[PDB]
Amino acid sequence: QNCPSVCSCSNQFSKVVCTRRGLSEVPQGIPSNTRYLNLMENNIQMIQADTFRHLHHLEVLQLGRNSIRQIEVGAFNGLASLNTLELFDNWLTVIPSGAFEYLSKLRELWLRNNPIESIPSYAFNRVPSLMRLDLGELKKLEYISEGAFEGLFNLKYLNLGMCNIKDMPNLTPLVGLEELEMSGNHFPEIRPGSFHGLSSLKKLWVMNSQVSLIERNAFDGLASLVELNLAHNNLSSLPHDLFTPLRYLVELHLHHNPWNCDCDILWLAWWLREYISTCCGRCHAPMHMRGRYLVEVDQASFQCSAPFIMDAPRDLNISEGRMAELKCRTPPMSSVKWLLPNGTVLSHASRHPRISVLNDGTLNFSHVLLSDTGVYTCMVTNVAGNSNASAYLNV
Amino acid sequence: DYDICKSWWEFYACQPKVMRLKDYVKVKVEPSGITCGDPPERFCSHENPYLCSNECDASNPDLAHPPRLMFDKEEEGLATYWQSITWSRYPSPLEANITLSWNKTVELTDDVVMTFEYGRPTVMVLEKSLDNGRTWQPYQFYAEDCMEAFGMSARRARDMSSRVLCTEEYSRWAGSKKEKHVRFEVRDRFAILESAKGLKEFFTLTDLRMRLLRPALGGTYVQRENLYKYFYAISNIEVIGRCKCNLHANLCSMREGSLQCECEHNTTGPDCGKCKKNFRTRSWRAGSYLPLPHGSPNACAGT
Ligand SMILES: *[C@@H]1O[C@H](CO)[C@@H](O)[C@H](O)[C@H]1NC(C)=O
Ligand SMILES: *[C@@H]1O[C@H](CO)[C@@H](O)[C@H](O)[C@H]1NC(C)=O
Ligand SMILES: [Ca+2]
């Protein structure tokens, strides 16, 4: 019916601002008309059960920049209209999974900059309506469960940046994820398994992550990819035909990388001239190319070698059940694919249950079967040309 | 070192106490309309483009961000900041000039430290005036890419000999919680009594100006989809120094709206640069540090 003394309302009565106060607790008489409530820059330590029980029109609850340590099970009861829940910059050490109970209209959950120690299994599963989740700046994060992101069928945005993550979490349940923010972590190598099951991904940000190498066919599974940000890393080159299966890739951020402008960047220099100016940065090496933008790098003054298959695959006589290898020592940046006798083509990205293509080009088997008999061709490609070498696998 | 003017009369050279110069500063924020609030604007984060929690409304005192917030005394963790409008006018540059007016010659003793909120500028200039804003000279150039912004070679004040340089050390994107400062290395420049003319004159000024040319970009190029991410926000500009009294005063106070030396040694004027009316037998001389420890007073005399 009326505005609280420690708060400031608006003519609509939609907006209630209670910022820059010495509040240790949430105001007692918040009007039922409220759509947007601001409770930032206060000393609130605990959100008691049924606190906002009668605020049925509340769309945005701003609880950011406070001292919130505990959130009770029924703290968010009666919040049928809640779309945005901002809980960033608090003292939360555990995700309040029970508190996010009946929030059927919740689309945005900001939990960034919190002393959250662990993301347990099936957390956020009680909110399948969630579309935007920010778990950034979690400096005290020690554990992420494999089933942590389970139940989030409608999630389109995930921010897990500045969490000091050393190895990629299981993002497979996020089937409909379109935007991923992984910037500010530690990933020296980007593997094809790192982003497995992210078919719907359109935007990928892996800035300031100390990336020194991107493995062969790493982004191959990311068919829907529109935007890729790999800026501010230690990248000197990218594998041949890395962006070729990315039919929808139009926005690229490749700057602040110590690019080695030799025959290996020529495919990229062509790709950017044909599909994309201030987006990709400059050559840091060799000295003759230093300072030039990779978009302005001209192949017209380049003399290149075709793929050198230094060690062609050797013929193998092996018994059923044994592990077998077909080596293919080729320049590390070249494109490598394997043609099996059945006619199927395998890459480093392929998820075959027995036969795997390693990053060095070698074809691993784990255990051979009677059906694995015939000619296996190592197919290598560069900007200068292509090379092929076959081997016969017996039993 | 040089605090006492008179004792037992016997005179000595004197300096006023080191002040927190931001307490007595006048502000000029150009152009008109650069400060947020009219009309109200919602600000988004570079870390999360959907996190648009903060708003600037000049009508509401709790949501307002006036220029005065760059100099006020702050309580533990309760930072107050001046905020600029969003880069809604892009591709047209988001430029702002913050002028620090004192109407008095002040000598710098410590580093000029500017504290930015939610991102430092990609391109900025720090300038000084000795004639209340008539002529201007640069102190230091700040750019993410020194060659792209000013066509100057990126140099560090740390690697310097016995000069105006461009530094890249205070412009990179490192988030909203880390690397909030842009500083002018006063103590390091002095580290390289001295009777050099240009030395004391270098750290002397009436005004300071910050030519904010390009805001924080969040690590990459500008994304036209959300321009509400790009703005300026300054919580504090710490200016530390003393009044220039030509070694004729030990007190500097607010008189007629601005700071003025409490002149001793029979001298007059704002900086004690002239002989007082009845003491003009000898022409005005500025006090000297030599010989140590008291120094030569060089007082004005009567008949
Ligand atoms: C593989 O077996 C064939 C006979 O089936 C033999 O001629 C060939 O030399 C063998 N190669 C190796 C490496 O054992
Ligand atoms: C900033 O000051 C310079 C003169 O030093 C002036 O030419 C320029 O137009 C000013 N810019 C703004 C936005 O006031
Ligand atoms: Ca302030």
SS3 letters across chain A: CCCCCCCEECCCCCEEECCCCCCCCCCCCCCCCCCEEECCCCCCCEECCCCCCCCCCCCEEECCCCCCCEECCCCCCCCCCCCEEECCCCCCCECCCCCCCCCCCCCEEECCCCCCCEECCCCCCCCCCCCEEECCCCCCCCEECCCCCCCCCCCCEEECCCCCCCCCCCCCCCCCCCEEECCCCCCCEECHHHHCCCCCCCEEECCCCCCCEECCCCCCCCCCCCEEECCCCCCCCCCCCCCCCCCCCCEEECCCCCEECCCCCHHHHHHHHHHCCCCCCEEEECCCCCCCECCCCCHHHCCCCCCCCCECCCCEECCCCCCCEECCECCCCCEEEEECCCCCEECCCCCCCCCEECCCCCEECCCCCCCCCEEEEEEEECCCCEEEEEEEEEC
CATH 2.60.40.10 intervals, chain A = 304-395
**How far apart (Å, rounded) are the C-alpha atoms in residues A280 and A116?**
36
Tell me the CA distances in angstroms from A249 to A223, A244, A321, one per residue in order.
9, 9, 42
Q: What is the DSSP letter of B22?
A: G
Q: What is the DSSP letter of B147?
A: H
| Residue A7: CB atoms within 10 Å | 22
Q: Is B13 helix (H, G, I), strand (E, B) or coil?
A: coil
Contact yes or no for B263/B248 (Cβ under 8 A):
yes
Take residue A269 and report the two structure tokens written for it: 């220099």
**How far apart (Å, rounded) are the C-alpha atoms in residues A151 and A126?**
7
Strands B123-129 and B240-243, how do they pair?
Answer: unpaired
Q: Which of B48, B60, B219 sits opposite A136 (nearest CB)?
A: B48
Tell me the CA distances in angstroms from A40 to A16, A109, A204, A248, B36, one per residue in order.
12, 16, 31, 41, 19
- Which residues of chain B are within 8 Å of residue A208 when distances are taken between CB atoms? 219
Give the technique used to solve this structure: X-ray
Best CATH choice for the domain A304-395 from the list 3.40.640.10, 2.40.70.10, 2.60.40.10, 3.90.79.10 = 2.60.40.10
Preceding omega of B291 cis (within 30 degrees of 0): yes
Closest approach of B159 to chain A, Cα-based (Å) = 23
**How far apart (Å, rounded) are the C-alpha atoms in residues B62 and A40?**
11
**How far apart (Å, rounded) are the C-alpha atoms in residues A192 and A185?**
18
Closest approach of B116 to chain A, Cα-based (Å) = 18
Tell me the CA distances in angstroms from B90 to A145, B211, B232, one per residue in order.
43, 18, 14
- Domain positions in chain B are 1-17+244-303, 18-243
Take residue A243 and report the two structure tokens written for it: 């962006």
Tell me the CA distances in angstroms from A281 to A151, A311, B27, B211, one per residue in order.
40, 35, 39, 26
Preceding omega of A286 cis (within 30 degrees of 0): yes
Ligand 2 contact, B136 CB (< 6 A): yes
Q: Which fold has domain B18-243?
A: Jelly Rolls (2.60.120)
By CB neighbour count within 10 A (0-12 exposed, 13-18 middle, 19+ buried), where does A329 fall?
A: middle
Count how many residues are written for chain B: 303
Ligand with smallest separation from the Cα of B28 = 2
| Residue B198: CB atoms within 10 Å | 6
Residue A187 dihedral angles phi and psi, to the nearest 5°:
-130, 80
Q: Which of B48, B175, B219 sits opposite A159 (nearest CB)?
A: B48
Q: Do B221 and A279 touch (CB under 8 A)?
A: yes
Who's near A139: CB < 8 A, 6+ residues apart? A115, A162, A163, A164
Tell me the CA distances in angstroms from A354 to A324, A337, B286, one per residue in order.
11, 16, 90
Place of tokens 């529109």: A226
Tell me the CA distances in angstroms from A295 to A21, A181, A381, B146, B222, one per residue in order.
53, 26, 22, 21, 18
Domains B1-17+244-303 and B18-243 share a fold: no
Q: Which of B47, B81, B225 should be substituted to probe chain A, the one whose Cβ sees the most A Cβ atoms within 10 Å?
A: B47
**How far apart (Å, rounded) are the C-alpha atoms in residues A307 and A330?**
7
Ligand 2 contact, B30 CB (< 6 A): yes
Take residue A330 and report the two structure tokens written for it: 């080729």
Q: Do A181 and B221 touch (CB under 8 A)?
A: no
Give me the sign of the Cα torsion angle A253, A223, A337, A297: negative
Take residue B20 and report the two structure tokens written for it: 């927190």
Q: Do A17 and B221 touch (CB under 8 A)?
A: no
Take residue B203 and report the two structure tokens written for it: 């750290």
Closest approach of B188 to chain A, Cα-based (Å) = 30
Q: Do B177 and A137 touch (CB under 8 A)?
A: yes
Name the CATH superfamily for A1-303. Answer: Ribonuclease Inhibitor (3.80.10.10)
Count how many residues are written for chain A: 395
- B177 vs A: CB within 8 A: yes
Q: What is the per-residue burial (b if ≥16 Cβ within 10 Å, else e) of B262-282?
A: bbbbbbbbbbbbbbbeebeee
Residue closest to A262 by CA, chosen among A222, A303, A232? A303
Q: What residues does A386 pair with on adjacent strands?
A: A381
Residue closest to B101 by CA, chosen among B132, B62, B64, B131? B132
| Residue A355: CB atoms within 10 Å | 19
**How far apart (Å, rounded) are the C-alpha atoms in residues B210 and B136?**
12
- Which residues of chain B are within 8 Å of residue A20 when distances are taken between CB atoms? 62, 78
CATH 3.80.10.10 intervals, chain A = 1-303
Instruction: Please name the helix (run of DSSP H) or strand (run of DSSP E) that holds residue B190, with its range, or none.
Output: helix B186-190
Ligand 2 contact, B198 CB (< 6 A): no
CATH number for the domain whose boundaries are B1-17+244-303: 2.10.25.10
The resolution in Å comes to 2.6
